Amino acid sequence: RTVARDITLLECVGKGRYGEVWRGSWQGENVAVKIFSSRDEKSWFRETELYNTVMLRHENILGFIASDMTSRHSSTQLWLITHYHEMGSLYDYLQLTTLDTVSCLRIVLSIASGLAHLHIEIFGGKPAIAHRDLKSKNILVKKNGQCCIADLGLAVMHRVGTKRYMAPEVLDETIQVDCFDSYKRVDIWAFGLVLWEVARRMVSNGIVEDYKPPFYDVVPNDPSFEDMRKVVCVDQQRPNIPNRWFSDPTLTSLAKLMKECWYQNPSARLTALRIKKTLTKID
Amino acid sequence: ARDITLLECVGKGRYGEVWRGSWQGENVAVKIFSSRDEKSWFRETELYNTVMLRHENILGFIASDMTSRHSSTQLWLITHYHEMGSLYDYLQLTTLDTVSCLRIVLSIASGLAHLHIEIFGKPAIAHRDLKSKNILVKKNGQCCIADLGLAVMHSQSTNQLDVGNNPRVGTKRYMAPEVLDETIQVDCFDSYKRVDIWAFGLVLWEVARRMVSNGIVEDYKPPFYDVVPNDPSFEDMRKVVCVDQQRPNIPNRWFSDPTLTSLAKLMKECWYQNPSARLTALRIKKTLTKID
Ligand SMILES: COc1cc(-c2cncc(-c3ccc(C4CCN(C)CC4)cc3)c2C)cc(OC)c1OC
Ligand SMILES: COc1cc(-c2cncc(-c3ccc(C4CCN(C)CC4)cc3)c2C)cc(OC)c1OC
Ligand SMILES: COc1cc(-c2cncc(-c3ccc(C4CCN(C)CC4)cc3)c2C)cc(OC)c1OC
Numbered sequence: 120r121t122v123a124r125d126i127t128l129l130e131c132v133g134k135g136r137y138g139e140v141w142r143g144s145w146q147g148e149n150v151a152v153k154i155f156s157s158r159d160e161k162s163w164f165r166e167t168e169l170y171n172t173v174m175l176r177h178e179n180i181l182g183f184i185a186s187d188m189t190s191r192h193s194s195t196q197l198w199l200i201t202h203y204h205e206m207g208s209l210y211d212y213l214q215l216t217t218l219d220t221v222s223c224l225r226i227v228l229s230i231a232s233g234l235a236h237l238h239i240e241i242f243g244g245k246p247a248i249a250h251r252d253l254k255s256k257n258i259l260v261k262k263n264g265q266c267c268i269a270d271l272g273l274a275v276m277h278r279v280g281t282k283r284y285m286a287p288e289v290l291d292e293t294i295q296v297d298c299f300d301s302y303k304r305v306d307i308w309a310f311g312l313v314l315w316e317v318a319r320r321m322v323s324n325g326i327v328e329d330y331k332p333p334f335y336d337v338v339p340n341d342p343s344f345e346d347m348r349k350v351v352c353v354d355q356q357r358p359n360i361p362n363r364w365f366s367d368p369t370l371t372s373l374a375k376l377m378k379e380c381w382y383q384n385p386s387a388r389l390t391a392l393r394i395k396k397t398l399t400k401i402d
Numbered sequence: 403a404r405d406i407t408l409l410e411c412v413g414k415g416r417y418g419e420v421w422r423g424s425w426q427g428e429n430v431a432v433k434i435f436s437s438r439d440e441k442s443w444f445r446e447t448e449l450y451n452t453v454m455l456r457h458e459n460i461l462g463f464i465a466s467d468m469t470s471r472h473s474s475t476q477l478w479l480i481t482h483y484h485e486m487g488s489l490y491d492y493l494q495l496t497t498l499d500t501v502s503c504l505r506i507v508l509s510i511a512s513g514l515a516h517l518h519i520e521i522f523g524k525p526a527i528a529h530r531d532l533k534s535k536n537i538l539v540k541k542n543g544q545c546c547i548a549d550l551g552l553a554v555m556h557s558q559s560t561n562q563l564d565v566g567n568n569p570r571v572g573t574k575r576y577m578a579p580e581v582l583d584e585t586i587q588v589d590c591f592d593s594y595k596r597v598d599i600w601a602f603g604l605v606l607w608e609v610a611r612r613m614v615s616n617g618i619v620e621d622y623k624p625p626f627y628d629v630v631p632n633d634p635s636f637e638d639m640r641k642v643v644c645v646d647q648q649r650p651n652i653p654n655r656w657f658s659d660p661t662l663t664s665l666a667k668l669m670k671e672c673w674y675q676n677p678s679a680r681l682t683a684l685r686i687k688k689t690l691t692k693i694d
């Protein structure tokens with residue numbers, strides 16, 4: 120039989136220290152191709168090792184197609200091939216879109232769904248998985264209004280995370296590194312920041328906030344580890360809840376939820392399953 | 403030009419299957435792993451990531467893939483294709499002269515020394531499943547070592563030992579005494595090199611039996627053919643190697659031939675029960691370079 124392996128790389132949709140992501144074509148179908156930098160080869164290895172352990176399949180997890188290693192004259196080429204989401208990342212989408220109540224809830228409950236699926240151990244099944252780099256750039260928007268979580272290059276099963284989204288126990292180096300629940304609690308912190316980024320773009324009473332990243336008002340671009348530790352750990356700052364949210368029942372309920380993702384004490388934070396239940400009772 | 407055509411199956415077993423395929427007008431070998439051996443696929447992929455692993459006497463890598471749709475996963479390794487097959491196949495079919503016998507065993511020693519020696523790059527690498535089915539014969543009369551799914555890596559420069567996560571064990575017939583009695587020092591890189599040396603000695607014996615001297619040759623037999631049941635168990639091998647202290651017998655006709663006399667001495671220095679007494683791969687390579 121013929122094994123068709125050619126992918127046509129059509130347009131670059133992302134470039135960074137990780138490498139590049141391309142829209143590509145296989146057998147008539149869009150795929151996304153992440154080409155890893157030498158700098159970030161361990162992210163390809165970790166994603167590949169995880170998928171070789173458990174073939175994750177969930178509507179709110181970016182869909183795996185292939186991991187490819189190709190020998191070159193002087194180097195090794197590493198590609199991760201996934202489903203392609205033409206609407207791009209949640210970060211991208213929130214810049215130039217506002218949300219209504221139904222679309223806001225649909226986004227955040229789909230993220231919570233993906234995250235709870237990662238976190239839960241299923242016997243028979245899947246190991247429990249913590250993401251360790253959850254952020255709005257690592258979430259893609261689907262045409263049906265749900266999102267999916269991407270990038271398992273730092274995932275742990277039972278490179279450092281993006282500093283802006285690091286939990287206080289990561290910044291003050293008190294995290295219990297031998298305890299798997301610690302890593303779930305770091306994801307919940309980051310989930311709460313993403314919830315804030317999305318909620319700001321939900322219209323109520325004719326008002327909306329501009330898109331801003333978490334802590335935009337207290338740290339520089341590319342904040343240092345120290346910049347973040349002083350905000351999050353020493354001063355114990357948290358993102359602002361605008362007054363206008365308290366006129367809207369949905370945003371009032373979301374503010375309460377995000378507060379319960381941001382407790383200094385990691386063990387006080389909500390679980391992804393409790394977040395899902397709370398979101399199903401909103402509206 | 404990434405497409406491959408699968409043309410014929412050249413092997414199926416517990417490992418999965420190997421195909422001869424076509425890739426930009428060249429023969430390639432395509433191994434499709436069994437799901438039972440998914441950890442070997444990943445380990446072999448980690449090993450072939452190393453650009454300085456490339457060597458005349460190591461099977462050349464082209465690509466590695468993991469593919470999936472729904473709940474089905476396939477695991478692929480694409481390599482150079484050697485139509486003469488494995489050393490195990492070749493030795494069934496042909497006898498050797500002195501020049502061919504030494505060319506084969508020096509090439510294997512050259513591959514093994516290349517694996518074992520760190521380049522300051524390529525880590526030091528112990529194979530852990532050396533056997534005649536894991537050695538391919540090339541049209542230039544040299545061989546190459548295949549199957550890095552059980553390999554261990556070490557760097558003395560950073561003091562790192564990477565034993566991997568693979569419950570697979572070596573081929574039972576070729577297991578060293580410290581593997582069969584499970585006293586091997588698992589956190590010691592030198593322990594794994596010494597396991598490879600034991601297995602190399604057995605492969606030397608398999609090859610030397612097929613070298614003609616004075617009009618005499620032995621039939622091809624696998625190591626310990628005479629003393630264990632067909633399809634020997636772990637305990638069968640432990641009995642002969644560890645309890646009975648058996649080693650392959652040296653046919654007395656070898657002692658009339660200087661080459662085979664030197665090879666018998668060399669394979670005995672691979673077979674000490676004390677692993678630390680065994681020769682190194684570099685010493686074997688140097689000794690075979692001097693033997694004629
Ligand atoms: C190696 O590399 C790539 C391969 C492919 C690809 C292309 N056609 C067919 C296939 C295929 C799938 C599955 C089987 C099964 C059939 C049932 N049988 C019982 C076991 C085996 C055979 C063939 C694949 C996997 C795509 C790629 O990219 C999209 C690849 O590169 C990453
Ligand atoms: C975070 O991580 C990964 C993401 C993806 C991924 C999957 N679908 C679509 C995309 C994408 C498409 C299109 C735009 C833009 C481009 C300009 N204009 C058209 C607006 C839209 C952006 C983004 C991506 C980047 C793939 C990955 O791996 C293969 C990722 O890594 C795991
Ligand atoms: C990697 O990705 C894609 C792969 C394929 C594809 C190509 N050939 C064959 C297959 C296939 C056939 C049959 C089995 C099974 C069936 C049941 N039992 C007998 C076990 C064996 C598995 C696999 C596939 C899935 C298509 C895709 O898209 C349409 C892929 O997505 C990009």
Ligand SMILES: COc1cc(-c2cncc(-c3ccc(C4CCN(C)CC4)cc3)c2C)cc(OC)c1OC
Binds near residue numbers: 412431433491549550
């Ligand atoms: C050991 O391991 C791997 C080996 C190979 C490989 C490469 N060239 C040629 C072969 C071959 C071809 C043909 C025969 C013949 C021998 C006589 N008669 C019995 C019919 C069959 C045997 C052997 C193989 C098996 C590829 C691999 O991966 C792609 C291997 O895995 C790393």
